[PDB]
Design a binder for this molecule. Sequence first.
Ligand code: CL
Ligand code: CL
Ligand code: CL
Ligand code: CL
Ligand code: CL
Ligand code: CL
Ligand code: CL
Ligand code: CL
Ligand code: CL
Ligand code: CL
Ligand code: CL
Ligand code: CL
Ligand code: CL
Ligand code: CL
Ligand code: CL
Ligand code: CL
Ligand code: CL
Ligand code: CL
Ligand code: CL
Ligand code: CL
Ligand code: CL
Ligand code: CL
Ligand code: CL
Ligand code: CL
Ligand code: CL
Ligand code: CL
Ligand code: CL
Ligand code: CL
Lengths: 162, 162, 162, 162, 162, 162
Amino acid sequence: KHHHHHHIKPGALCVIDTPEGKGTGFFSGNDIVTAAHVVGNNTFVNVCYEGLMYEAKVRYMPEKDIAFITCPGDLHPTARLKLSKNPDYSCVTVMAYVNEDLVVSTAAAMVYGNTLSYAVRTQDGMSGAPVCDKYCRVLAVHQTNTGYTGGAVIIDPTDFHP
Amino acid sequence: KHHHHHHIKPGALCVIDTPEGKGTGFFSGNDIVTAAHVVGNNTFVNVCYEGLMYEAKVRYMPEKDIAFITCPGDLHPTARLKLSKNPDYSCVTVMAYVNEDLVVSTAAAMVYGNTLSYAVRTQDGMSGAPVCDKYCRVLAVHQTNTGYTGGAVIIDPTDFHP
Amino acid sequence: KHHHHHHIKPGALCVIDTPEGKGTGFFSGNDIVTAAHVVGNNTFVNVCYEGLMYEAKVRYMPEKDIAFITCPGDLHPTARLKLSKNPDYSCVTVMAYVNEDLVVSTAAAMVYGNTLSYAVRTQDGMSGAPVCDKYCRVLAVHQTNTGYTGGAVIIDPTDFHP
Amino acid sequence: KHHHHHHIKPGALCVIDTPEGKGTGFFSGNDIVTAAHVVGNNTFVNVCYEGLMYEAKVRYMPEKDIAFITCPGDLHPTARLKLSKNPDYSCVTVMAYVNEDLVVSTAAAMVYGNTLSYAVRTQDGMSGAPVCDKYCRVLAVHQTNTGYTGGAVIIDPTDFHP
Amino acid sequence: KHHHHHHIKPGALCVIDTPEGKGTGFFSGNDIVTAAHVVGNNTFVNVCYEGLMYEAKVRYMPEKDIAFITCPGDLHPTARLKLSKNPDYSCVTVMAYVNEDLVVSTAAAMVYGNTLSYAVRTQDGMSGAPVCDKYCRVLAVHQTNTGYTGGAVIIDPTDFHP
Amino acid sequence: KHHHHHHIKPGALCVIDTPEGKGTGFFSGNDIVTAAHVVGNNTFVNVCYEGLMYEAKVRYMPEKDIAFITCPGDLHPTARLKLSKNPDYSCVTVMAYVNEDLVVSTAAAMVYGNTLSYAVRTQDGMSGAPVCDKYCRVLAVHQTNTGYTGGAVIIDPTDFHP
Ligand SMILES: [Cl-]
Ligand SMILES: [Cl-]
Ligand SMILES: [Cl-]
Ligand SMILES: [Cl-]
Ligand SMILES: [Cl-]
Ligand SMILES: [Cl-]
Ligand SMILES: [Cl-]
Ligand SMILES: [Cl-]
Ligand SMILES: [Cl-]
Ligand SMILES: [Cl-]
Ligand SMILES: [Cl-]
Ligand SMILES: [Cl-]
Ligand SMILES: [Cl-]
Ligand SMILES: [Cl-]
Ligand SMILES: [Cl-]
Ligand SMILES: [Cl-]
Ligand SMILES: [Cl-]
Ligand SMILES: [Cl-]
Ligand SMILES: [Cl-]
Ligand SMILES: [Cl-]
Ligand SMILES: [Cl-]
Ligand SMILES: [Cl-]
Ligand SMILES: [Cl-]
Ligand SMILES: [Cl-]
Ligand SMILES: [Cl-]
Ligand SMILES: [Cl-]
Ligand SMILES: [Cl-]
Ligand SMILES: [Cl-]
């Protein structure tokens, strides 16, 4: 019994940089999406993609611990993540930049209310990482870890706009 | 600075099952390639792909610690890996099945003769895993680890046949 | 004049197996679609794809003689069929499994009410086969033949749910 | 057990027209390939593709019952067939124009020296039709049928030039 | 700074012919789109694509200076253009036929209301040419030139039907 | 009699920057190819791609007026150009950066020994631009324009190495 997942798109990832620290971001629609705490109170953030840094404006901060950043007009990503129409939360693919490295792993996952729990392969920083279904559609945004157990908040289309 | 690698193909992976345990294999040409110790003394091995188990026969065991298995005629993989023409060994993407999970990570790497060394994300079983360049072409086959340092044997087209 | 049709996807086909016999099914959305009489009054059916058998649960049986089956979670089809936006019923592509063989043919067609009619090269059972337009989008689900004339029930996005 | 074949390219087919009759041709490289008897002693043939007729010139008639026609400069086919690297002759996909209609079917096959034999769905002529492996690569050129048994001549890359 | 634009699709272009002259058309959905004045009062126009001429019937003439022609059933284009969801008008890619030849150029554009202004690379007939965003989605339909300054009418999904 | 060309890849273009001025470059294999005079006597040139400038080293200067630059290890282009196997010099596609803009055009071409002549759409510098066949494979490297007449030197696989 193995997790044979599909449409894994590491090119949909970027690195978010702020004075306070760094996180993982991901392209979806016209947005860059990340964890709220990566952005904090900042109105603008630095975005790193394929070795070039951009300045980007924070668009929307809902009540959920997610942040929406307007993708810079000159940043043309090779891949973007779509949301799931028929979400199966039973297994996931997690993609992240951890320090200098890409880290991708599959895991089985469990739901608690608005939250998802799953195993991760590093204890280092994964904040903002997209948690995708077996078909590569984003289900959730990685928030935190306790040891090798990860936790994410579920995202849905209604989160994008007030 | 981050390792933003390309043409990462987890669909080119399979699991090799023997009475001694399990390893990772990968599709290349008409073969399934793995580490010699994954095959052991089993002329016939089990191959698991997309949830279906196949019996497959070892084709060739060169001097290098690598094994070539004939891909079953009814096994139609969605992806295969090609070897590099102009190999850059400075950085790598390693893709493996670790227990039930896909684990993919990038790393800086170093060459010591026929051996490639690189940081790994698990101490667990990565035997047979393809070690690819930044463009997703196979450079080497993962053999062993000492802690979080992995070691692989470099592969070239002349290794495929006697 | 020849029917030069496009986007023909045999990977979107599977075989449905019941105690009463076999038929063709096709992947569309998160469903496997077939003719109602292939399923009958069975609540569960067997689905065969790329050499693996799965048990699958019948989801929905509308007034039309079409059956919707929930695609098993572990079955990841390489292709799915989409419905036509602006249907041209003047000609078709029919794809089916007949015993061990894939069979694809084009034909002139005529629509009348909810039935689509077209010549079939063979009198073999094609129950549940997708009947596609010239661009590979599904127009109808093949029902029966009399004897060299096929009959299919036209399919609509509203047919998927009550 | 079913023949679940891949990379089936009906857009790689055309129709060859002569005073003596019509046949199937297929694009490979810069050529259109057909059976030697579809061309006969003609130096120029008519080629029909996507509704447009072209005049084309016969390039090469080797000893094998196969004919090579230079593809007209203004005919830009949407698909071409490649030859097999590691040819499996045990099963096939046959693609043909039969009158106005595309006909595609799979079958088990067997080699007899230079000849490949296989079941055909129709007793209608399919002269010049490509006989492909399970991966859509061309193995042979259909020559004749006797009842429901088709016969083809195996093709080499060496057959393309003297 | 350079305009590095994407998804440029010349196969989505055709040439429209009337007794009064010629213009550029483009495929979108089931239609061919062009400038209203290319069509004029004609109910049928001639369409040229990949070397074959077709007769095509004008479908709908909205208040905007845009013409919608029903794509001939036997005309199967290799590419079609989609409209943008969140249109960025700041830079464009213009694709047209000028006499026998394809001409593609980028420009910065100004929005204004229902009209779009940009630099063009020729003073010749570009009437009906698609004006695309940096991602190859149609924003507008080219109308006229005053020197090397082009003007276009913005296209909207609601323009397709009354 | 329009030119309907294919596989146009503007993503395979870059800009070469030197103290003496600028040119167009194109990705092929592991190289960036341009006109010899773009590079001149420089050992290192600057390369601009998707908004990021890199330093690159000149690999090889053959007797032909063509220059080979090693692609920077951190520059990962989205497209590369291949050479043609059966070169048709009758017509071409020329792709270039002209100041800030991308310019793409087709034209009939004229052969004089190892050189090619064709119409171009600008009088501004295009030095180093790829001259492609109707299928988007590179035939020649653009050298200079005199007025709206472009001149290029034909390239073959042996030019890449001494
Ligand atoms: Cl498995
Ligand atoms: Cl899975
Ligand atoms: Cl950063
Ligand atoms: Cl699951
Ligand atoms: Cl970075
Ligand atoms: Cl990198
Ligand atoms: Cl297993
Ligand atoms: Cl590196
Ligand atoms: Cl025809
Ligand atoms: Cl047709
Ligand atoms: Cl398919
Ligand atoms: Cl079955
Ligand atoms: Cl029709
Ligand atoms: Cl089966
Ligand atoms: Cl098979
Ligand atoms: Cl095709
Ligand atoms: Cl014909
Ligand atoms: Cl077989
Ligand atoms: Cl630039
Ligand atoms: Cl841009
Ligand atoms: Cl195109
Ligand atoms: Cl014309
Ligand atoms: Cl812009
Ligand atoms: Cl034309
Ligand atoms: Cl042409
Ligand atoms: Cl491109
Ligand atoms: Cl620059
Ligand atoms: Cl030409």
